Structure 1
Amino acid sequence: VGAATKKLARFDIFKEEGFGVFLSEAALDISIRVKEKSRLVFSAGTDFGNAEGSAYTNAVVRNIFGGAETLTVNASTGTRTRSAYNATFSTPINGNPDLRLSVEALRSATQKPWASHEEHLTGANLRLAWLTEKGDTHALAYSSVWRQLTGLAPTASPTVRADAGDSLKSSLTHTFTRDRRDNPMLPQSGYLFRSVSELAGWGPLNGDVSFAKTEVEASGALPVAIKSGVSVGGGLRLGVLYPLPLGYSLTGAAQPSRINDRFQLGGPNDVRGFKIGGLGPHDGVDAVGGDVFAAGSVNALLPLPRTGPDSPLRLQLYANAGRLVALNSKGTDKEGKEGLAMDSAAVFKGVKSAVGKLTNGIPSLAAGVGLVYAHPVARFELNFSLPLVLRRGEEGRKGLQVGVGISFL
């Protein structure tokens, strides 16, 4: 009945605190109790008079028929155009609370100050998230978006002036996470392999981008010796952005990636000791990303001496690293054809050479010291870092490196 009750709680429609299992030794006679989570929850607080529209709508219907669930978030600032949608619809496929499907349609308008522009996304994606009994978690999503770039207000750069159109990016991407760490918000003893692949427009997938994005993230952690929360850390990351032809082939012609698709490696969440978008093939001041990259870390996370195994507020002694290169061809005969159509051989040679450049020279090697606070929902770093080695034009940072979030190193 432990398996029964855990499988029951996995439905995410029963309130977490208070279940009860009452065994009446009458003449089994098991009696379970539950609480219901809730039903329709609403909020709509709007303001006006001036530019403020603050339409502020929220809605959650926890259970429509079975496990179904519709989230509907909204906003209207009156300054920004709108966020007219964010509408999810989750429902287990008739078999278990483990295999959960969800369908989401969105229309948001992000912002990217590090490569100065905005980006209007108005797609709608379909997701199918498994969960294996061993703890692993697979997922698989199909997303189709619009990706408009309309904010080149300052002197941005000749790079983004050349990549400021539209796209579709219909893609099919599959994550994977094996979580074996004791405290997910402050790893001390576990390990964490997480692999997120993605195939964009290719073969049956139609669009205007055609790549294959791979993003592997390992981990590690270990307390050594004299409950002594030593907690030696670890980390690593990798990645490649491989362009491909536009249909049902491997050999063809590929157009190099757009700024909408490259990686950006820096900031308090990925490699501390840098701007939010440092460590790139920078152009002027705007941070253009790259395709290949890497990472690293070596932590200590020692607790406050003479204080004891208190709440997890510990000193963080950590080195760091990072590298992020771009797909320069510069190795074949001139295309002859007008511009952006690389044959397969040139793309392969370019990515081989790029990975070759990844292993030439010491990467960046920051440092720091910070007071980690492991809240159950978030983690607060507050580091104070010192970037050792830079490439010219990577926007080093040296003050107080405040950071908040979930993903860290």
Structure 2
Amino acid sequence: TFTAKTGTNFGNDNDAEAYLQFEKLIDKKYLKLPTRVNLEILRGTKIHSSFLFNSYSSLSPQSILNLKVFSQFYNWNTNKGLDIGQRGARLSLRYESPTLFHEWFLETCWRSTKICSQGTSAPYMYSGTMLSQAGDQLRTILGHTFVLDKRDHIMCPTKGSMLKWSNELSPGKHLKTQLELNSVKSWMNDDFITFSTTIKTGYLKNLSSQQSLPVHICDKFQSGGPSDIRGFQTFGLGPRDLYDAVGGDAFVSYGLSVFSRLPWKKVEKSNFRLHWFFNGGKLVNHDNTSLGNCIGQLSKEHSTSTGIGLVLRHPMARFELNFTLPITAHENDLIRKGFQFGLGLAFL
């Protein structure tokens, strides 16, 4: 009924947010629907401060409103990078064994953008693109997210597929579309050899009146990292201005992985698997005229990598210790070959 709790949500680049959450299950004489407020204080190496009020409220047997009022400061694009002020509200309606849910939201957000790169480090975050991303902006964004997770485990999958289709419309500014598929197959009687494909594609159209009002660097697509195409640093792929990953307006990022259960007699009941993968993808700044020239550059010049490793699959995390070599790369990519620790929840 109060339940002050703790934990870690395990962030984008091997990173981790330590959080502290309060809660109150509310009686039925302010409301009549089951309401569940929250208050999250988050802590991390990237986060400066993060307050996150929540208000979940079951409208139906299959309906959950979620008024999320947030005010978060966090750092971004790690060499020294940018720290993002981000405050606003978000009213999300989520609608409903294959897991199936739609989730429409609506989010107002005043967003600040410091370049905290401390210019003694000379050419980093001081390109012409990043110098124009600095400043304040206010943005309403409409959204939709459909998930058709048919897998039998979102922890240690063995069968099933997945389909994550998330559209985001900032009216008059941009329209972000993103697709994500997954497919897990197994071939032996112990679920021994686990084949796993992941393909993620996305498109970002500028709906802004003769190509004014550019899309912010935090909304563009980024590629590379351990929770992405392994073998490169985070924000390591795509086009650059000077040395800064300025993101792309369209991308594809495929993946293949085999898990082989660590064939020793004592330890073959555990979550340790032998991991060979093959990742790769492309991140382009398209011209907004044709979907045919968007696909045309999205299949010509890819940055791929394979690599052998070991993977542990815990409840809240998937620990990956890969040795990775990039087969094919672009020129201006940020290579991370050799050993690489992977940690998080979303790998592709």
- Normalised by the size of structure 1, how large is the TM-score? 0.73
Distance 1:277 1:76, change over 3 A: closer
Among 357, 360, 368, the alignment partner of 2:307 is 368
Among 218, 224, 227, the alignment partner of 2:187 is 224
| Structure-2 separation of matches of 1:367 and 1:82 | 38
Distance 1:311 1:280, change over 3 A: same
Q: Report the aligned-residue RMSD.
A: 2.4
Residue 72 (1) aligns with residue 30 (2): no
Query: What corresponds to 2:320 in structure 1?
Result: 381
Query: What corresponds to 1:175 in structure 2?
Result: 145
Unmatched segments (≥5 aa) in structure 1: 1-38, 45-55, 203-209, 247-251, 330-346
Deviations 1:252-306 (A, max 9, x none): 6554423132110110001111101111212333221001100111211111113
Query: What corresponds to 2:13 in structure 1?
Result: none
The AA in structure 1 aligned to 2:63 is L
| Structure-2 separation of matches of 1:228 and 1:40 | 41
Query: What corresponds to 2:14 in structure 1?
Result: none
Distance 1:182 1:111, change over 3 A: same
Task: Give aligned-pair identity as a percent.
Answer: 29
Query: What corresponds to 1:10 in structure 2?
Result: none
The AA in structure 1 aligned to 2:237 is L
Shift of 1:390: 1.4
**Higher RCO (Cα < 8 Å, 6 or more apart):** 2
Question: 4+ residue runs of structure 1 moved beyond 4 angstroms?
Answer: none
The AA in structure 2 aligned to 1:74 is I
Among 89, 110, 116, the alignment partner of 1:124 is 89
| Structure-1 separation of matches of 2:331 and 2:248 | 16
Summarize the alignment of residues 181-260 of structure 1 with structure 2, pairs less than 5 Å apart. Answer: 181-202=151-172, 210-225=173-188, 227-245=190-208, 254-260=212-218
Shift of 1:245: 3.3
* Contact 1:280-1:289 at 8 Å conserved across structures: yes
Residue 314 (1) aligns with residue 278 (2): no
Shift of 1:161: 0.6
Shift of 1:188: 2.1
Between 157-166 and 66-75, report the one with greater CA deviation: 66-75
The AA in structure 2 aligned to 1:317 is W
Distance 1:134 1:395, change over 3 A: closer
Shift of 1:146: 1.2
Shift of 1:352: 3.9
Deviations 1:73-103 (A, max 9, x none): 23799xx8744x311011111x21x211110
Distance 1:198 1:42, change over 3 A: same
| Structure-2 separation of matches of 1:277 and 1:136 | 31
Between 147-156 and 230-239, report the one with greater CA deviation: 147-156
SS at match of 1:306: coil
| Structure-2 separation of matches of 1:366 and 1:144 | 39
Shift of 1:171: 0.7
Residue 278 (1) aligns with residue 236 (2): yes
